[PDB]
A paper describes a structure:
KDM4 ([name]) is a conserved iron (II)-dependent jumonji-domain demethylase subfamily that is essential during development. Vertebrate [name]–C proteins contain a conserved double tudor domain (DTD) and a potential zinc-finger domain at the carboxy terminus. From our biochemical and structural profiling, we find [name], KDM4B and KDM4C DTDs display different histone-binding preferences. We show that these DTDs use an aromatic cage as a general mechanism to coordinate trimethyl lysine and, most importantly, the sequence specificity is largely determined by side-chain interactions with surrounding residues.
In all the structures, [name]-DTD forms two lobes (HTD-1 and HTD-2; HTD, hybrid tudor domain) with interweaving β-strands. [name]-DTD, which displayed strong binding to H3K23me3 as well, also bound H3K4me3 and H4K20me3, consistent with previous findings. [name]-DTD binds H3K23me3 peptide at low micromolar affinity (Kd=2.2 μM), slightly stronger than its interaction with H3K4me3 and H4K20me3, and KDM4C-DTD displayed highly specific binding to H3K4me3 (Kd=6.8 μM).
Numbering used by the authors: 897 to 1011
Amino acid sequence: QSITAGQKVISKHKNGRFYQCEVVRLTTETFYEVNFDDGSFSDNLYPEDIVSQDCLQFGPPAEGEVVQVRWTDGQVYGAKFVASHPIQMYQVEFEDGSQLVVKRDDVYTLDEELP
């Protein structure tokens, strides 16, 4: 089942419960993968988290390129760029006006049983 924009669906609100919501847009989110200098691996960096070069302006680093990364703790780490992969996601709006950007697997059609 493809999900299309304008479709009523069911997904989890920010309060953690399933509600009907409406798909307002199909977006593409690009995630970066890097190997930190200590060998730990991240698969979901945003391009703007690369702080050794301007990837929002000039695209991803070359594969294997040395980079510095601003992590979710606000600190900067050395790493090496592994890959980038774009992911189709679904911007949904709930009855209260709140919105989320979610993965295909987190969206359910009205006809289907919920987990």
